[PDB]
Design an enzyme around this catalytic site. Structure first.
Site, PDB file in Angstrom:
ATOM      1  N   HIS A  41       0.999  -1.053   0.047  1.00 22.33           N
ATOM      2  CA  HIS A  41      -0.150   0.037   0.196  1.00 22.33           C
ATOM      3  C   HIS A  41       0.814   1.343  -0.073  1.00 22.33           C
ATOM      4  CE1 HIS A  41      -2.983   2.873   1.422  1.00 22.33           C
ATOM      5  NE2 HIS A  41      -3.954   2.311   0.912  1.00 22.33           N
ATOM      6  N   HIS A  42       1.773   1.319   0.972  1.00 24.72           N
ATOM      7  CA  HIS A  42       2.731   2.523   1.049  1.00 24.72           C
ATOM      8  C   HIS A  42       4.101   2.098   1.685  1.00 24.72           C
ATOM      9  CE1 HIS A  42       1.576   3.556   5.065  1.00 24.72           C
ATOM     10  NE2 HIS A  42       2.996   3.857   5.253  1.00 24.72           N
TER      11      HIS A  42
ATOM     12  N   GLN B 257       9.798   1.218   6.735  1.00 22.75           N
ATOM     13  CA  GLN B 257       8.222   0.679   6.921  1.00 22.75           C
ATOM     14  C   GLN B 257       7.369   0.372   5.675  1.00 22.75           C
ATOM     15  OE1 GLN B 257       5.364   3.829   8.779  1.00 22.75           O
ATOM     16  NE2 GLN B 257       5.546   2.407  10.239  1.00 22.75           N
TER      17      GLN B 257
ATOM     18  N   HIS C 130       4.043  -0.878   4.328  1.00 25.88           N
ATOM     19  CA  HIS C 130       2.521  -1.115   4.774  1.00 25.88           C
ATOM     20  C   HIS C 130       1.770  -1.886   3.808  1.00 25.88           C
ATOM     21  CE1 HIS C 130      -1.682   0.558   4.830  1.00 25.88           C
ATOM     22  NE2 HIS C 130      -1.938  -0.341   5.639  1.00 25.88           N
TER      23      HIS C 130
ATOM     24  N   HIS D 219      -0.051  14.255   7.111  1.00 25.86           N
ATOM     25  CA  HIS D 219      -0.337  12.887   7.821  1.00 25.86           C
ATOM     26  C   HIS D 219      -1.309  13.171   9.027  1.00 25.86           C
ATOM     27  CE1 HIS D 219       0.016   8.898   9.451  1.00 25.86           C
ATOM     28  NE2 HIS D 219       0.563   9.660  10.578  1.00 25.86           N
TER      29      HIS D 219
ATOM     30  N   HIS E 117      -4.725  10.622  11.196  1.00 27.32           N
ATOM     31  CA  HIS E 117      -5.338   9.273  11.050  1.00 27.32           C
ATOM     32  C   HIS E 117      -6.800   9.565  10.488  1.00 27.32           C
ATOM     33  CE1 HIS E 117      -2.364   8.200  14.239  1.00 27.32           C
ATOM     34  NE2 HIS E 117      -1.691   8.097  13.193  1.00 27.32           N
TER      35      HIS E 117
ATOM     36  N   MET F 171      -2.886  12.424  14.824  1.00 30.96           N
ATOM     37  CA  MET F 171      -1.735  13.119  14.289  1.00 30.96           C
ATOM     38  C   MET F 171      -2.146  14.155  13.760  1.00 30.96           C
ATOM     39  SD  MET F 171       1.265  10.073  14.274  1.00 30.96           S
ATOM     40  CE  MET F 171       1.910   9.513  15.445  1.00 30.96           C
TER      41      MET F 171
END
Ligand SMILES: [Cu+2]
Ligand SMILES: [Cu+2]
Ligand code: NA
Ligand code: NA
Ligand code: NI
Length: 309
Positions: A62-63, A125, A127, A197, A199, A269
């Protein structure tokens, strides 16, 4: 695919090399999963990251985010990270989004890493999305290929991070604004990319340079849209005496309890990552604003900051 016998370091020429930062053949068991791994830099001395190439599966990923830091959260092979990336400050270098193709660094621009003061580690990271393309039980080695050089770059890439710390979103509250502002007190920086960014409560995130009262748009984005680094419409310089100002618009609708800033999916966030370059002799690699020094100034914030894109 996975690199096997050749390993992660490709020599390019005398002073350059590609470093491949890949998952150690992982198999996500659930959907919406977040994997992390770390790579110590192969070189102790100062190096410059001048390019990134994504090595992602075009169905499961996804990312991807890449960070520089000195102390990744976990040691070893890999760990699960709902953006619990580093123990020290994680310096974002790169974002790849499935639906938003990344823009290249401008030529002559690089991040400084390694040495006495630069990052000693990369943290990747990844996702993972729907994980249906895993019924074969195959091993995933998605990641990023980084182009490193010891040739000093005339322009140094950095990150100005703006983030809310104190936001409280009462349950059912239609509009909650999280405002961030700091006076800029360094040598001139030129913004060339931004990332937003939040949520799931976030509606719109906007960042501005305020000079003599005038608001100049750096970036404005729906944070529910892919959270890539998007190019800046007009390369905005930020110079000593300028104020940087940001607003995330939130809602408490759908929530039974108050939402505050925090590190889980059920928290919120408000992050605005402003990627800039500076002349090498003037450059610093990272600045942060977690304050609101001119709160009354936000009364002349453009209307676009309050309506969702
Ligand atoms: Cu994602
Ligand atoms: Cu977050
Ligand atoms: Na998080
Ligand atoms: Na206002
Ligand atoms: Ni300029």
């Amino acid at each position: 695919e996975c690199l096997g016998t050749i390993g992660p370091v490709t020599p390019l020429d005398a002073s350059d090399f590609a470093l491949d930062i890949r998952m150690p053949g992982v198999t996500p068991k659930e959907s919406d999963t977040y994997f992390c791994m770390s790579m110590r830099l192969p070189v102790d001395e100062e190096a410059f990251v001048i390019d990134f190439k994504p090595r992602a599966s075009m169905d499961t990923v996804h990312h991807m985010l890449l960070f520089g830091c000195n102390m990744p959260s976990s040691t070893g092979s890999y760990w699960f990270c709902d953006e619990g990336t580093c123990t020290d400050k994680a310096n974002i270098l790169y974002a790849w989004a499935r639906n938003a193709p990344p823009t290249r660094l401008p030529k002559g621009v690089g991040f400084r890493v390694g040495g006495e003061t630069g990052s000693k580690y990369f943290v990747l990271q990844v996702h993972y999305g729907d994980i249906s393309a895993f019924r074969d039980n195959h091993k995933d080695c998605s990641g990023v290929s980084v182009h490193l050089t010891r040739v000093p770059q005339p322009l140094i890439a950095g990150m100005y991070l703006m983030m809310s710390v104190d936001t409280v979103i009462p349950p059912g509250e239609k509009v909650v604004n999280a405002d961030i502002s700091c006076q800029y007190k360094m040598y001139p920086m030129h913004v060339f990319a931004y990332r937003v960014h939040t949520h799931h409560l976030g509606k719109v995130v906007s960042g501005y340079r305020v000079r003599n009262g005038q608001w100049t748009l750096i970036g404005r984005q729906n944070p529910q849209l892919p959270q890539a680094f998007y190019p800046v419409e007009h390369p905005v310089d930020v110079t000593f005496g300028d104020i940087l100002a940001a607003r995330c618009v939130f809602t408490g609708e759908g929530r039974t309890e108050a939402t505050h800033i925090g590190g889980t999916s059920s928290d919120e966030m408000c992050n605005l990552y402003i990627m800039y370059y500076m002349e090498a002799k003037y450059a610093l690699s990272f600045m942060t604003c977690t304050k609101n020094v001119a709160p009354d100034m936000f009364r002349t914030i453009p209307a676009e900051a309050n309506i969702p894109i």
